[PDB]
């Protein structure tokens, strides 16, 4: 039940200096995983043919 | 009357200003660097200083996926670039 | 020859630490039987009281008793004051803070998020690569 400290992307009330790995620990935009579909292939191939 | 080549002093001040202000205050960072604007600071960060940007040598499977996607989505490097995991400028340069 | 090992686990409770502290203090104390049997022979039947006996408002401790109590309590206060041992301050680590509170916040951040932000640290040291 321990709560980690909030490191915000917006607010820095006491003007601290936070290490870059800590500052960019936004995992959701690293696990978002832009995954392509397989129907682009049919389109591209049919257009070249 | 802004911009030009990026020197190393400006990049280290850019990193320290990211460490103090974050990635959503680029106009506070650009008041710390003269001859660079907020858009230029942000562009420089996301294109050469973000520590996810793989600056190593291209592998074989990356360039296979590159040729597949570049035949698959013509001139769409901002769309290809998050899929193959490199910056779109790196991606376009290596494709050419 | 005897042998005993007593380490501690984590915190878990302000009452478990109390109980550990109490067992330490209560093993350390040694009774003097002379005063004990003196008071026993003096008080007689009421020396084994119940909840409602009568003796609640009567006892007056002689100066040596209260001196022993105050000495014990000062030892206890000192042992409590040594609770957070100050880790030594090396200045060879590349500092990462512009302030004194900033350093302790970065330490708490390395406690909590140090297990996760370990690839990005490797990127930052190798030249923002991989």
Q: Span from first to last CA of chain C?
A: 60 Å
Q: How many beta strands in the DSSP annotation of chain B?
A: 0
SSE topology string of chain C: HHHHH
Estimate nothing, just give the exact number of structural domains of chain B. 2
Shape descriptor of chain B: elongated
Question: Termini distance of chain B?
Answer: 31 Å
Estimated radius of gyration of chain B: 16 Å
Quote the beta fraction of chain C: under 5%
Outline the biggest β-sheet of chain C.
none
Q: Let me know the largest β-sheet of chain B.
A: none
Question: Which chains share the greatest interface?
Answer: A-B, 20 and 18 residues
Shape of chain C: elongated
Query: Looking at the chains present, what oligomeric state does this protein adopt?
Result: part of a larger assembly
PDB class: splicing
Keywords: Human Intron Lariat Spliceosome, splicing
Entry title: Cryo-EM structure of a human intron lariat spliceosome prior to Prp43 loaded (ILS1 complex) at 2.9 angstrom resolution
Chain A: SNW domain-containing protein 1
Set down the secondary structure blueprint.
This is part of a larger assembly, with chains A (49 residues), B (96 residues) and C (130 residues).
Chain A: H1 20-23, H2 40-48
Chain B: H1 8-21, H2 26-29, H3 38-49, H4 60-72, H5 77-84, H6 88-95
Helix pairs in contact in B: 5-6
Chain C: H1 14-28, H2 33-43, H3 63-81, H4 100-113, H5 119-126
Features:
part of a larger assembly; 3 chains; A: 49 residues; mainly alpha; B: 96 residues; 2 domains; elongated; Cell division cycle 5-like protein (chain B); mRNA processing (chain C); acetylation (chain C); spliceosome (chain C); nucleus (chain C)
Model description:
This is part of a larger assembly, with chains A (49 residues), B (96 residues) and C (130 residues). Helices cover 27% and strands 0% of the residues of chain A. Chain A has helices at residues 20-23, 40-48. Chain B has 96 residues and is mostly helical. In chain B, 61% of the residues lie in helices and 0% in strands. Chain B contains six helices and no strands. Chain B has helices spanning 8-21, 26-29, 38-49, 60-72, 77-84, 88-95. In chain B, α5 (77-84) crosses α6 (88-95). Chain C is mainly alpha-helical and 130 residues long. Helices cover 52% and strands 0% of the residues of chain C. The longest helix of chain C is centred in the middle third of the chain and has 19 residues, at 63-81. The chains are: A mainly alpha (49), B mainly alpha (96), C mainly alpha (130). Chains in contact: A-B, A-C, B-C. The PDB classes it as splicing. The entry lists the keywords Human Intron Lariat Spliceosome, splicing. Cryo-EM structure of a human intron lariat spliceosome prior to Prp43 loaded (ILS1 complex) at 2.9 angstrom resolution. Chain A: SNW domain-containing protein 1. Organism of A: Homo sapiens.
């Amino acid at each position: 039940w321990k709560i980690p400290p909030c490191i915000s992307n917006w607010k820095n009330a006491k003007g601290y200096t936070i290490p870059l790995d800590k500052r960019l620990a936004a995992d959701g935009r690293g696990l978002q995983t832009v995954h392509i579909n397989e129907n682009f292939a049919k389109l591209a191939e049919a257009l070249y043919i | 009357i802004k911009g030009g080549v990026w020197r190393n002093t400006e990049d280290e001040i850019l990193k320290a200003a990211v460490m103090k202000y974050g990635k959503n205050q680029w106009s506070r960072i650009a008041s710390l660097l003269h001859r660079k604007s907020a858009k230029q600071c942000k562009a420089r960060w996301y294109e050469w200083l973000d520590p996810s940007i793989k600056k190593t040598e291209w592998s074989r499977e990356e360039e296979e996926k590159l040729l597949h996607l570049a035949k698959l989505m013509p001139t769409q490097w901002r769309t290809i670039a998050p899929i193959i995991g490199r910056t779109a400028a790196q991606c376009l340069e290596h494709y050419e | 020859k005897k042998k005993r090992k007593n380490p501690d686990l984590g915190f878990s409770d302000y009452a478990a630490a109390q109980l550990r502290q109490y067992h330490r203090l209560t093993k350390q104390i040694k009774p003097d039987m002379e005063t004990y049997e003196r008071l026993r022979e003096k008080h007689g039947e009421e020396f084994f009281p119940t909840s409602n006996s009568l003796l609640h408002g009567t006892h007056v401790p002689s100066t040596e008793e209260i001196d022993r109590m105050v000495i014990d309590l000062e030892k206890q206060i000192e042992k409590r004051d040594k609770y957070s041992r100050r880790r030594p301050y090396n200045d060879d680590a590349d500092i990462d803070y512009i302030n004194e509170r900033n350093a302790k916040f970065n330490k708490k951040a390395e406690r909590f998020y140090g297990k996760y932000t370990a690839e990005i640290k490797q990127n930052l040291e190798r030249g923002t690569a991989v």
